[PDB]
Enzyme design. Sequence first.
Site, PDB file in Angstrom:
ATOM      1  N   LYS A   1     108.956  88.235 121.288  1.00 17.84           N
ATOM      2  CA  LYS A   1     110.068  87.284 121.356  1.00 17.84           C
ATOM      3  C   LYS A   1     111.230  87.562 122.307  1.00 17.84           C
ATOM      4  O   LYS A   1     111.670  88.707 122.462  1.00 17.84           O
ATOM      5  CB  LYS A   1     110.630  87.055 119.947  1.00 17.84           C
TER       6      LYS A   1
ATOM      7  N   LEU B   1     102.185  84.986 112.873  1.00 15.10           N
ATOM      8  CA  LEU B   1     102.237  86.195 113.690  1.00 15.10           C
ATOM      9  C   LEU B   1     103.391  87.129 113.334  1.00 15.10           C
ATOM     10  O   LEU B   1     104.435  86.685 112.842  1.00 15.10           O
ATOM     11  CB  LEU B   1     102.392  85.808 115.158  1.00 15.10           C
TER      12      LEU B   1
ATOM     13  N   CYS C   1     143.746  55.848 118.725  1.00 19.65           N
ATOM     14  CA  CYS C   1     142.756  56.176 119.739  1.00 19.65           C
ATOM     15  C   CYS C   1     143.552  56.927 120.816  1.00 19.65           C
ATOM     16  O   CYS C   1     144.579  56.440 121.307  1.00 19.65           O
ATOM     17  CB  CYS C   1     142.167  54.888 120.297  1.00 19.65           C
TER      18      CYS C   1
ATOM     19  N   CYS D   1     139.864  48.635 125.519  1.00 18.22           N
ATOM     20  CA  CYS D   1     140.000  50.093 125.631  1.00 18.22           C
ATOM     21  C   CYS D   1     139.384  50.482 126.973  1.00 18.22           C
ATOM     22  O   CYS D   1     138.269  50.070 127.290  1.00 18.22           O
ATOM     23  CB  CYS D   1     139.261  50.784 124.485  1.00 18.22           C
TER      24      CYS D   1
ATOM     25  N   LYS E   1      97.516  87.838 122.695  1.00 18.50           N
ATOM     26  CA  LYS E   1      96.356  87.922 121.810  1.00 18.50           C
ATOM     27  C   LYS E   1      95.229  88.713 122.461  1.00 18.50           C
ATOM     28  O   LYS E   1      94.888  88.485 123.634  1.00 18.50           O
ATOM     29  CB  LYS E   1      95.809  86.523 121.497  1.00 18.50           C
TER      30      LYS E   1
ATOM     31  N   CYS F   1     136.885  52.961 118.118  1.00 17.22           N
ATOM     32  CA  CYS F   1     137.975  52.135 118.633  1.00 17.22           C
ATOM     33  C   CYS F   1     137.558  50.669 118.748  1.00 17.22           C
ATOM     34  O   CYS F   1     136.641  50.314 119.505  1.00 17.22           O
ATOM     35  CB  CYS F   1     138.440  52.663 119.989  1.00 17.22           C
TER      36      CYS F   1
ATOM     37  N   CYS G   1     143.936  54.800 124.465  1.00 17.28           N
ATOM     38  CA  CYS G   1     144.418  53.413 124.608  1.00 17.28           C
ATOM     39  C   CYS G   1     145.536  53.125 123.616  1.00 17.28           C
ATOM     40  O   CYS G   1     146.221  52.107 123.724  1.00 17.28           O
ATOM     41  CB  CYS G   1     143.294  52.386 124.403  1.00 17.28           C
TER      42      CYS G   1
ATOM     43  N   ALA H   1      89.995  39.621 111.229  1.00 16.46           N
ATOM     44  CA  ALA H   1      89.061  39.361 110.134  1.00 16.46           C
ATOM     45  C   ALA H   1      87.830  40.268 110.209  1.00 16.46           C
ATOM     46  O   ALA H   1      87.183  40.543 109.193  1.00 16.46           O
ATOM     47  CB  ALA H   1      88.639  37.895 110.147  1.00 16.46           C
TER      48      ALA H   1
ATOM     49  N   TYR I   1      95.466  75.593 120.515  1.00 18.60           N
ATOM     50  CA  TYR I   1      95.077  76.933 120.923  1.00 18.60           C
ATOM     51  C   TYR I   1      93.993  77.673 120.142  1.00 18.60           C
ATOM     52  O   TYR I   1      93.147  78.322 120.738  1.00 18.60           O
ATOM     53  CB  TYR I   1      96.323  77.807 120.970  1.00 18.60           C
TER      54      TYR I   1
ATOM     55  N   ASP J   1      88.585  43.626 108.568  1.00 14.95           N
ATOM     56  CA  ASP J   1      88.451  43.676 107.119  1.00 14.95           C
ATOM     57  C   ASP J   1      86.988  43.789 106.705  1.00 14.95           C
ATOM     58  O   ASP J   1      86.688  44.052 105.542  1.00 14.95           O
ATOM     59  CB  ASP J   1      89.108  42.460 106.467  1.00 14.95           C
TER      60      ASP J   1
ATOM     61  N   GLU K   1     100.260  83.673 126.262  1.00 12.55           N
ATOM     62  CA  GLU K   1     100.654  82.276 126.304  1.00 12.55           C
ATOM     63  C   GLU K   1     102.060  82.120 125.757  1.00 12.55           C
ATOM     64  O   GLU K   1     102.588  83.045 125.142  1.00 12.55           O
ATOM     65  CB  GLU K   1      99.647  81.406 125.528  1.00 12.55           C
ATOM     66  N   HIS K   2     102.676  80.966 126.003  1.00 14.45           N
ATOM     67  CA  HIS K   2     104.035  80.718 125.537  1.00 14.45           C
ATOM     68  C   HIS K   2     104.125  80.277 124.076  1.00 14.45           C
ATOM     69  O   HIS K   2     103.115  79.945 123.464  1.00 14.45           O
ATOM     70  CB  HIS K   2     104.739  79.717 126.463  1.00 14.45           C
ATOM     71  N   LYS K   3     105.334  80.314 123.517  1.00 12.08           N
ATOM     72  CA  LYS K   3     105.580  79.918 122.134  1.00 12.08           C
ATOM     73  C   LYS K   3     106.221  78.539 121.945  1.00 12.08           C
ATOM     74  O   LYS K   3     107.402  78.349 122.231  1.00 12.08           O
ATOM     75  CB  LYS K   3     106.442  80.959 121.435  1.00 12.08           C
ATOM     76  N   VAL K   4     105.464  77.621 121.348  1.00 12.23           N
ATOM     77  CA  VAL K   4     105.918  76.253 121.102  1.00 12.23           C
ATOM     78  C   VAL K   4     106.525  76.094 119.689  1.00 12.23           C
ATOM     79  O   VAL K   4     106.868  77.092 119.057  1.00 12.23           O
ATOM     80  CB  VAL K   4     104.739  75.286 121.319  1.00 12.23           C
ATOM     81  N   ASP K   5     106.696  74.855 119.206  1.00 11.47           N
ATOM     82  CA  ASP K   5     107.281  74.579 117.866  1.00 11.47           C
ATOM     83  C   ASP K   5     106.536  73.492 117.010  1.00 11.47           C
ATOM     84  O   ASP K   5     106.184  72.437 117.541  1.00 11.47           O
ATOM     85  CB  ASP K   5     108.754  74.151 118.032  1.00 11.47           C
TER      86      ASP K   5
HETATM   87  P1  LIG Z   1     108.041  81.787 116.792  1.00 10.10           P
HETATM   88  O1  LIG Z   1     108.676  83.035 116.324  1.00 10.10           O
HETATM   89  O2  LIG Z   1     109.022  80.710 117.003  1.00 10.10           O
HETATM   90  O3  LIG Z   1     106.843  81.346 115.836  1.00 10.10           O
HETATM   91  C1  LIG Z   1     106.102  80.153 116.123  1.00 10.10           C
HETATM   92  C2  LIG Z   1     104.858  80.152 115.243  1.00 10.10           C
HETATM   93  O4  LIG Z   1     103.997  79.122 115.729  1.00 10.10           O
HETATM   94  C3  LIG Z   1     102.719  79.648 116.117  1.00 10.10           C
HETATM   95  N1  LIG Z   1     102.505  79.464 117.598  1.00 10.10           N
HETATM   96  C4  LIG Z   1     103.369  78.874 118.432  1.00 10.10           C
HETATM   97  N2  LIG Z   1     102.857  78.863 119.669  1.00 10.10           N
HETATM   98  C5  LIG Z   1     101.679  79.435 119.637  1.00 10.10           C
HETATM   99  C6  LIG Z   1     100.692  79.706 120.573  1.00 10.10           C
HETATM  100  N3  LIG Z   1     100.858  79.349 121.855  1.00 10.10           N
HETATM  101  N4  LIG Z   1      99.549  80.337 120.189  1.00 10.10           N
HETATM  102  C7  LIG Z   1      99.350  80.706 118.913  1.00 10.10           C
HETATM  103  N5  LIG Z   1     100.291  80.448 118.000  1.00 10.10           N
HETATM  104  C8  LIG Z   1     101.446  79.826 118.304  1.00 10.10           C
HETATM  105  C9  LIG Z   1     102.639  81.093 115.685  1.00 10.10           C
HETATM  106  O5  LIG Z   1     101.691  81.305 114.627  1.00 10.10           O
HETATM  107  C10 LIG Z   1     104.080  81.457 115.311  1.00 10.10           C
HETATM  108  O6  LIG Z   1     104.100  82.149 114.056  1.00 10.10           O
HETATM  109 ZN   LIG Z   2     140.598  52.811 122.817  1.00  7.53          ZN
END
Ligand SMILES: *P(=O)(O)OC[C@H]1O[C@@H](n2cnc3c(N)ncnc32)[C@H](O)[C@@H]1O
Ligand SMILES: [Zn+2]
EC number: 6.5.1.2
Length: 581
Positions: A312, A85, A406, A427, A288, A422, A409, A35, A221, A38, A114-118
Site C-alpha cells: 500500500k 489480502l 447573502c 443576484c 501475487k 439566495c 448581493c 408480448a 482478476y 412474456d 497489478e493496481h488496487k481498485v475499489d
Molecule cells: P485495499 O487495501 O484498498 O483493498 C482492496 C481489496 O480489494 C481487492 N482487490 C482490489 N484490487 C485488486 C486486484 N487488482 N487484484 C486482486 N484483488 C484486488 C483485494 O482483495 C483487497 O483486499
Molecule cells: Zn445573492
Amino acid sequence: MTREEARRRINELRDLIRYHNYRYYVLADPEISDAEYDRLLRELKELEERFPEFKSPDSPTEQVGARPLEPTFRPVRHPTRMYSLDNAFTYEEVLAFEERLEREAEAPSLYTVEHKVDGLSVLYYEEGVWSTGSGDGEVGEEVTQNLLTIPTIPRRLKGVPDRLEVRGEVYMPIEAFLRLNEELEERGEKVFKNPRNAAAGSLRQKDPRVTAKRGLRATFYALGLGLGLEESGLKSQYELLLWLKEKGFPVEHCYEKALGAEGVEEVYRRGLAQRHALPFEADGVVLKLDDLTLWGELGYTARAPRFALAYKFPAEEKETRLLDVVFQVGRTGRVTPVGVLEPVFIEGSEVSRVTLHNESYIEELDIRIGDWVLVHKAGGVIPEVLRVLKERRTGKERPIRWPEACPECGHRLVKEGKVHRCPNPLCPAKRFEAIRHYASRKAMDIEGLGEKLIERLLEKGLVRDVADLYHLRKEDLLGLERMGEKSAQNLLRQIEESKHRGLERLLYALGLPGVGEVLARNLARRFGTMDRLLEASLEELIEVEEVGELTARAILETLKDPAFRDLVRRLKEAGVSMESK
Ligand SMILES: *P(=O)(O)OC[C@H]1O[C@@H](n2cnc3c(N)ncnc32)[C@H](O)[C@@H]1O
Ligand SMILES: [Zn+2]
C-alpha cells in the site's frame, strides 16, 4: 426434459428475461416484442414448477409485471470463499513476505503486479451462462440486475469450465465519482467520502436504471470454481488476466511482471508516481505469486492468502484545527460552506481552505469551529474533513451557522429544502445560469446564445440580466467577440423572435422556485397574464395542479420581490409578451 436440461433452460430464460428487462426499461432499445417477452417469462414459471428445486428468489418471476426488474438483495453464499489480502506498508515487509515464501525453493520468485481498485464482487456462471452476481463478506448480497447496467460484464462465455466463478471488482471512476458527488451536494444530500462506497451505493439501487446513469465500470482478476483444478489450463497469473480478457471479461486495471521483492518495489514506485494519473482511485498495488500451481501448496491464513500481498501507498491523512468557516454562493444560488483550516501538509501541497459541502455534511460529521479535524483527500483529489476528533474538544467550539443575508448581493437568505440559498432573481452570482436557462429551447428559444457568448457578454459588461439581451439591439455591440455582422444579425433576430413566446414558456424561463416546465403552463393558463399572476393570493396558487403549500408560499414571495418586479417590468417594456400563447 432431463433434470440437467431444465436447469440450463432455466438459467437461459432468467438471463434473456433480465437482458431484455434491461434492453427495455433501461436502454430503451428492445429487440423482441412486449408480448413475445412474456412467452419466456411464463415458460420460466412452467419449468420452475415441474422442477420446484430450481426456484431461486433471484428469478424474474418473484416480482414481475411491466415494472423495472429489480435485484433481490438477498444474502447468498459464494461457491468458494473470497478472501482478503494482508497489508504491507514498507519494502521491509514486502521483502519479509518473499522471505516467508522461501520455506521451499530459491531466493527471487517471479510475480505479477497489478493496481488496487475499489468495490469487491463475484459472478457465478453455469455452462457458460450467468446465474447470479453478489457482494462480499462470506455471504454476499445478490445484485445480478445492477451488474447488467455495466455493458462490459459478459453474459455468455465460451470454452469455459461447467462451473465458473470469476471474481474482480466493480468501481466508479474519479470523474463520475466527482460528478455524482456534485449532484448530491446541490440536492442537499450527504456526499460519499470515496469511490468504494459510491460504487457500493450506485450498485445497491432498487431501480437498476439509476445504476446505469452512474459511471460504474468493472474489472476482473481472479477465478474460483473453474481455476485449473476444474477445467482451465491456467498456470500463470499473467496468463489468467489475458485469459479473462479474451473471454469477454473487462480487465482494465494495470498489471505487469516483476522479479523478486526488489523488482516488485521497482513497479511499486513507478506506480506511486502515477497514483493520481489513473482514471480511478488506486490506493496501492497487489503483488501475487505468478505460479498458480504453487498456490495450492501455499494455503490461506484465517483471513488471507500466502501467495499474494497488498503493498500500500502511504496513507495521506493529517490532523488540524478548523479555524473559521466562510460562505460562498454557487452558480445556482446555493450558499456553499467553506472551512478555513490551520495550514497543514498532505502530499506536499499545503491545505488551508477545505469544502464543507453542505449543511447535511456539517451536521452528520458534527463539524464545529474550535474543533480539531482529520482531513483527507476524497478519491485522492479533493481535500475534505474525513471526521472530527471529538474527544479533544475544549467545549468552546462554535456551531456552524449560515448568515442572515447573502454575502454576494445582500438579499435575505431562504432555506429551500435541505440547502440554504439566495432567492434574489438578480443576484450577480446567478447571472450566467439565469441567462442560460432563459435561452434554452425549453425556455425562450435563443439558439445563438452559446455557453461562451453568455460569459463574454457578462465579462464585457453588456449584460447584467435577462432583460438586457433585448437592449443589445445595437449589433455594434455584437460585432467584436468572434462575430462580424454575418453572425451578429442572425442572433439579433433570435432575441427579437423570443419576445413572442407566451407566459407558459416565459415563467419557465425566469426560473421561479419550483415552477417546472409543466407547473409553468398550468400556472399560465390559470392566470392569463404576468400582471394577473403578480396579484395572486396564496389560495389561488394552491388551487393549481401540482402546486403544494410549500411551493405556493415560495412563488408568492418571489412574486413580491422588488427585484422580480423590476426584472419583469424591464422585460415588458422591451416588448416581451406577458400573456398566454
Ligand atoms: P485495499 O487495501 O484498498 O483493498 C482492496 C481489496 O480489494 C481487492 N482487490 C482490489 N484490487 C485488486 C486486484 N487488482 N487484484 C486482486 N484483488 C484486488 C483485494 O482483495 C483487497 O483486499
Ligand atoms: Zn445573492
